[PDB]
Design a protein around this nucleic acid. Structure first.
Lengths: 64, 152, 384, 103
RNA sequence: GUAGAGAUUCUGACGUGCAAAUCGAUCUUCAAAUUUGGGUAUAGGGGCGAAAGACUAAUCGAACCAUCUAGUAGCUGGUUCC
RNA sequence: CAGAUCUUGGUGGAAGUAGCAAAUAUUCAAAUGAGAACUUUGAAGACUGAAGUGGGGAAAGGUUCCAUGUGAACAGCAGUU
């Protein structure tokens, strides 16, 4: 299946970049039926699509 | 359609052909020359070995710049290659001839490749760009392939 | 103008790969019927190189009666096995082999020479010949008498015992060795009694003898004229390269001459280096192979950790001075000198004072494991 | 009999001794596949993504000299006459271990 | 000295190229006689020119387009069966 | 018509040859599919490093935007894109 449209919609709904969008690889069939922003929000509520956290950038060495 | 030759019995032979096949004419000719006169089972084994790089197709006529290998020793030559695209096209046509023989009810143990021939199909033209704003041909060389298999 | 000698020698042409690997004798020493029957060639394997220190006995020299250091090459020479005899008649078209007589039994090592896949073969190489040998024993005598009656050159067929050599190759090297001595009849008789028998290195060669080393040089592959012929590098500004010859020919003749340096093969060539002096013929059944009268330490001729890429020499060996053609573990041919030696250097007896047995796998500083033990004391893994 | 699991130690250093820096990790993957093919006589080799992470742990130029692999020959979901090798990584203190069998 | 604007050398790469002028290193200038967008004016024996006969749509010691024009050529090539 | 560096068109040897090498770099598993090195997902390793390979505009282009399908031609390799 192709999920390029779903990834674009998920990034817009989550207000993050496409690099932070995570989809469950075990729910490809269910994710592919979204086709809509309301369905994308339903996927986010169900936890199938989440926003990955920011990459680690600590200032411990800088402060020391 | 008319085939180039009938070097067999019409009641005990099978035919197959492919027109405007997007494969190199020179490579197809070398494969056709190599597989000519061999049994259908041994032709399938040889084509599989070429695909798996166990045996090589010798290049006799169109051999300019072709590299050398040890797998051409069995053919008495030094220049041989492994054209996978040509082998796949010949493999499909041989399978079609096998199906035609099965439909005609021929004995599928004595099937000898009697007549295999490759001809040059009309060329498809593309464009390549050279230095100083020059445009040059980028033609392809598709081939017509016909195969006749009979009984010994 | 600005004359200079030409680059390279035209005598070593063509600079192609040698058609052989063993290294053949192009000319055996002139036969003499007064000296007793003896061999004129031998085969060995290059085990490696080392260096020695010895007193220089040379009156008038600056370093007379003073120690000098010299590099030597070690060649493992286990005894060879004679399995055949070949007779050559002198025809107006050269030497022609008349017949070849083989021994009744041939070992697996020599039998492997006649096969490319000995294991897959049916091992039928001299079965009928052995049957003829055992049937009634008249054909062998008839052929031997034919070699005695006719023929002027007698050569025995002898093969190396590569089995007792650490080389992974199991196929043995077979070679014709000319037999010099008195009369063809004695040559054939000597071959007959030496059938299925071993000939040692010290029976063929002796200490302080000048011999020749024949072998194929180390392969170098294709190489440009700069390193193949030692030509001058072109200036840095040279467009399209600078490791070539600027002028490969002139107009009229409108052809490239054979004397112009060209890129091509630069190694794996047949050569024979002359005047190699035997410094030591050591045996494989004594623990003092590398021990001298000035160094009474019981050590054998093997560097610490073994010879690099060769192994351990447990057989007889030779200590030819200088370098020899070919890489390590290659089979080399030793030939009796064709010339007569009367110079001080050639006739000077050699008495070694010290033979280096330190590791050649690095900057070795210990000659023996005992010396390493004493210097280093106890280590962590040594004590426990 | 056919379904056997064994733990191996692969000396990656001697296989990557002359590889270009931009190809050492991909060549290590290929050497692992060839290693499994030679040992288990199976054309099909499947590499655990965790093992791929372990190979690529120190970048593309620095692959560990020795790796502890677990070669398990299994039957596929296809016709039961085809066998494949599944390769995994084993976490051990010192990888200088001999080949062992896993029950 | 960065951005920007240029192009000294390697007479480097390329030189049927990525490119009918480019690529790399190096180099010149970098707060003014600076660089530049858009609008507008100057048109071919004319314009414009810190001046090289330079630029004026890859065309410049007189642009391009069509016609006179199938211009003329003591010059070159060709000029068809027995 | 045998020529005119003739005109138009077609087709050769060179030739399966030169070549498809700037811009650091890809790997594992799964899904789809007849077919996966190029599609999608997950994981890992990297790059642009805010005078960006980010987000927008002016000129210019004109539907290239989006969804659903196709893989005949193009994407100088491939193609399910």
């Amino acid at each position: 299946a192709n999920l390029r449209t779903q990834k674009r919609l998920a990034a817009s709904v989550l207000k993050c970049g496409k690099r932070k969008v995570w989809m469950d690889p075990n729910e490809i069939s269910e994710i592919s039926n979204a086709n809509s922003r309301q369905n994308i929000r339903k996927l986010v509520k169900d936890g199938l699509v989440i926003r990955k956290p920011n990459l680690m950038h600590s200032r411990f060495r800088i402060r020391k | 359609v008319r085939y180039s030759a009938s070097p067999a019995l019409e009641t005990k032979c099978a035919k197959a052909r492919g027109a405007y096949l997007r494969t190199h004419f020179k490579n197809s000719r070398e494969v056709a020359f190599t597989i000519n006169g061999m049994s259908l089972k041994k032709a399938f084994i040889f084509l599989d070995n070429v695909k798996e790089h166990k045996q090589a197709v010798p290049f006799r006529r169109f051999n300019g710049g072709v590299g050398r290998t040890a797998q051409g020793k069995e053919f008495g030559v030094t220049q041989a290659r492994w054209p996978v695209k040509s082998v796949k096209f010949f493999y499909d046509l041989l399978k079609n001839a096998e199906a035609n023989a099965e439909a005609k009810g021929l004995d599928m143990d004595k099937l000898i490749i009697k007549h295999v021939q490759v001809n040059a199909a009309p060329k498809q033209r593309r464009r390549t760009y050279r230095a100083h704003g020059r445009v040059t041909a980028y033609l392809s060389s598709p081939s017509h392939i016909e195969i006749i298999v009979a009984e010994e | 103008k600005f004359e200079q000698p030409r680059h390279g020698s035209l005598g070593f042409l063509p600079r192609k790969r040698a058609s052989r690997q063993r290294g053949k004798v192009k000319a055996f020493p002139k036969d003499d019927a007064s000296k007793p029957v003896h061999l004129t060639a031998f085969l060995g394997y290059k085990a490696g190189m080392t260096h020695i220190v010895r007193d220089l006995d040379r009156p008038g020299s600056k370093m007379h009666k003073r120690e000098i250091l010299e590099a030597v090459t070690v060649i493992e020479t286990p005894p060879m096995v004679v399995v055949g005899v070949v007779g050559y008649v002198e025809t107006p078209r050269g030497l022609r082999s008349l017949t070849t007589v083989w021994a009744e039994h041939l070992s697996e090592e020599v039998k492997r020479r006649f096969y490319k896949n000995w294991f897959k073969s049916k091992k039928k190489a001299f079965t009928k010949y052995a049957k003829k040998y055992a049937e009634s024993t008249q054909s062998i005598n008839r052929e031997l008498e034919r070699i005695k009656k006719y023929c002027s050159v007698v050569r025995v067929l002898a093969h190396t015992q590569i089995r007792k050599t650490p080389l992974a190759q199991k196929k043995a090297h077979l070679m014709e060795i000319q037999v010099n001595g008195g009369s063809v009849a004695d040559k054939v008789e000597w071959a007959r009694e030496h059938f299925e028998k071993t000939v040692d290195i010290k029976s063929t060669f002796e200490q302080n003898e000048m011999i020749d080393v024949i072998g194929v040089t180390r392969g170098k592959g294709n190489e440009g004229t700069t390193a193949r012929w030692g030509t001058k590098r072109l200036p840095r500004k040279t467009h399209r390269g600078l490791r070539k010859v600027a002028c490969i020919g002139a107009w009229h003749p409108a052809n490239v001459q054979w004397t112009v340096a060209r890129a091509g093969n630069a190694g794996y060539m047949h050569r024979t280096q002359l005047n190699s002096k035997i410094y030591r013929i050591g045996a494989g059944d004594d623990a003092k192979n590398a021990s001298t009268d000035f160094d009474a330490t019981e050590k054998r001729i093997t560097p610490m950790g073994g010879f690099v890429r060769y192994g351990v020499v447990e057989n007889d060996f030779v200590m030819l001075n200088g370098a020899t053609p070919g890489p390590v573990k290659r089979v080399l041919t030793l030939r009796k000198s064709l010339l007569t030696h009367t110079s001080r250097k050639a006739l000077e007896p050699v008495s070694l004072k010290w033979i280096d047995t330190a590791s050649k796998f690095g900057h070795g500083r210990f000659q023996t494991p005992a010396e390493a033990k004493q210097f280093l004391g106890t280590l962590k893994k040594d004590v426990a | 009999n056919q379904v056997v699991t064994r733990d191996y130690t692969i000396h990656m250093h001697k296989r990557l001794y002359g590889v270009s820096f931009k190809k050492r990790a991909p060549r290590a993957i290929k050497e692992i596949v060839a290693f499994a093919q030679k040992h288990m006589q199976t054309k099909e080799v499947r590499v655990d993504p965790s093992l791929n992470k372990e190979v690529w742990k120190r970048g593309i130029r620095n692959v560990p000299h020795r790796l502890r692999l677990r070669l398990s020959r299994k039957r596929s979901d296809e016709d039961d006459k085809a066998l494949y090798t599944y390769v995994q990584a084993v976490d051990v203190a010192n990888p200088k271990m001999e080949t062992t069998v896993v029950e």
